[model samples]
Target: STGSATTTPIDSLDDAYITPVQIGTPAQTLNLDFDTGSSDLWVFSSETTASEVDGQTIYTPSKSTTAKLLSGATWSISYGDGSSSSGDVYTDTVSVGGLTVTGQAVESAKKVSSSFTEDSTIDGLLGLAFSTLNTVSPTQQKTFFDNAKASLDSPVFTADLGYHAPGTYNFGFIDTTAYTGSITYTAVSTKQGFWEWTSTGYAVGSGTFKSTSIDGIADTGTTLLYLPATVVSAYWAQVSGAKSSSSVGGYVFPCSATLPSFTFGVGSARIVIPGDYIDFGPISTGSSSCFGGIQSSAGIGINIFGDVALKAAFVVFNGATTPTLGFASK
Candidate 1:
């Protein structure tokens, strides 16, 4: 059966969105980030060290009769932002919205980086990427979507992430009313285990679009939009008093500066990110300068079309034979 769930931003951070999920026979519910960047349904659990867990909720597998330990199996993951988590594995009943998957591999964290431990609201991450990206030792694990796909009427999911507001994650169906205009479909190259695509070009403000081919991935877990160093530089050049700062860790501009609109090409359609959306937030408490939500993907290798970029459009993560990304203005 098809199902859908609400996703909301975390406070003023607006860094990521989270959705509720039920795990185990008794169905212990936890709010997890639906991450498209990596594959693994991991959670803070009873196995996590007491000192490592801040105020986050923990999933106690022992409390669920259907939970079965996957002997000798373990999982560890590290994010590009330096956040990491690792734990033992268990197979249990896991459900999202009205959809349920039996005997799904649930990773229980025993260790976590300070970033994850400090973010008390996020209990774990539910990976929606290809199962090939799963990080389980001894044997690879399948994501909830992978295990439940065959039973679904349509193997698809739509991400309608909103800016500073609640959005929706729909499974097995597309809500035509959720978006406007025609959905522009583009071929996705999943060889990298990501929803990777090529952007034909981009433009700043009302300038002519530059025909620059850029390869990037659509990642819901990441907060900022990252592009090549040259691209980032070109965008910031349009703003006055904008400069890259090592202390601030990214490009920052005066809060009052008039930022230019950024646009990227997807087939014949142009997805535009408003000027205000580019200003992430104030650099720090009481600072008059704001860090840019768009930065250089230099050392990261691949560019990331993170929440800042995704929230500007309605996205369809088509799971058909030739997986495609359909986009439309919201």
Candidate 2:
């Protein structure tokens, strides 16, 4: 909503990251990839080949006079990181932030590569997480919260996560000062749409970590907090001299001491993870370390708890009131 196309961050899945969407009007910035695993809102075109479009960000549709293209349909995308692409099908006048959402249907990349055509900072991907892995089909799919939820005025959507640094995906509203409204309610598991839980461990400050009580999952499409190895060695044995560096990437920790106040249970609500987001970077070396959203899943036996623990609250996956996952406070 600023310039140089603001909303940055994008890495092909596996820890989620993507943003930068400015569509139509007099504006036309694009570098989107903010997927909460799937819904649909696509782009990638100028007829595609500028060398595949290099790092992508090309949408032309004849310079939008309120573009439109859904004739006969045809769209494709395969990425779980393997990457793939297809095209045809567009509708225009899309804008975000300053709000505009007329018609919108997009997905016009006539084939792409060179890592999504040299991804020039992003020009497609706005899946707004959750709509049941939608690959677009309720007769011509549409999402970015269903076209900015009828011109967003606060239909609630916030993603503020500052890991790897700088954050915010706020749309429509829900900035109740970033929360503390104390929410911890769960129940949405028709088996594998995933959002399970059971953890009998995780504590900080007074330091504790036990969970083998297993069974856990809370993925905002994942990005840390995988736990298990007896809760990642009793939560890195309470900071204090915490040094388990392999260059701080095993789950970061090379501290200069003075760390405490942690907490991570689930059934009885615990949740805290602040120590500046657990020393979020710079424990020496090249500095900028801090971050211990708990990791190491070994062979990956459940326990995801990602999006850095739901960016500390206000997450709702209500699948229409019954597929639950509503944690609040912001």
Candidate 3:
């Protein structure tokens, strides 16, 4: 079985992407963040504390006749960045696009961090990463993609993220029309549970290409592109008034400054991120300083090719026994 979903950016800058997810017997639809960086199908539910419940749509298992609670099963997860949620588990019918999975383990949030409470646009996260990272104890649960892979046409899923526009996520088969040119396939390291891969090299605008191996993960959950400090500084130095400000956090530049495009190589394939996308709009409403879409991952230990980079190309997450990633230009 194949499925498709159109994801919309939560904000004008494409900070996060949200897609519709139908859960339970009555099929209550909630907008969820389709994240590839982590694995846990947790959601804001009726079980959540009143203090943490905001404007998000909550899933009520009791309302679904087919819902069955996973007795004694509980889950707790915390992101180093502070936005975390913990809850109980229930198995029910969950659907995304046209793909339906019965008895899918759905974590019902009991408590959530303030950041999640503040972001009312997304109800929860649909993790697409490896199931080994699942937080449920005793009996680990598989992700929606992993569960549906055997029934799919090709056991694969593709991501097509856009800038200030809607993008499509296709399961089972690749949409030939969605991208241009042949795809470039690269080996993926699943040991870390992320879609980790090596980049051939990087080129700043029209400058020389620095032939080096850069390791990073393709994370849809993250907002910006983070790379080595040297590479990050190289790009920022080209901008007229760009500076790394602690108060504003990361690098920021004049909203009107001329920015250069960024390019990364996957084998011989080159994906160019337009300069306009690098200018992630003003820091605040009508503010003159804008946050850089690309930042340094020096202290973070790992580089992240987030929406800023993924939006430049079409990505395929191959879910075969031996997984590999596919990249192509659109």
| Per-candidate clashes, comma-separated | 0, 28, 0
Give lDDT per model, in order: 0.92, 0.59, 0.92
The regions of model 2 sitting more than 4 angstroms off are 1-15, 18-31, 35-55, 63-66, 69-121, 124-237, 240-252, 255-291, 294-305, 308-318, 326-330
Ranking, lDDT, top scorer first: 3, 1, 2
lDDT of 1 by residue, 129-183 (tens): 9989999999999988888888877988889998889999988998999999999
Decoy 3 TM-score against native: 0.98
lDDT of 2 by residue, 1-330 (tens): 211112433542223455656566556777576655555677787876565765555778777666766777776768543677777777777655555666777777777655656555656677655445545443657665655554455454555564454456566655556557665656656364355656556665665554546566665445566766666666667664454556655656654555565556655666666655444445454764545656667666566767666665556544333554556534
Query: Which residues of candidate 1, in runs, are more than 4 Å off?
Result: none
In model 2, where is the ten-residue run with the lowest total lDDT?
1-10
Candidate 2 or 3, higher TM-score? 3
Q: What is the TM-score of each candidate against the true structure?
A: 0.98, 0.32, 0.98
Task: Flag regions of model 3 displaced more than 4 Å.
Answer: none
What is the alpha-carbon lDDT for the whole of candidate 2?
Answer: 0.59
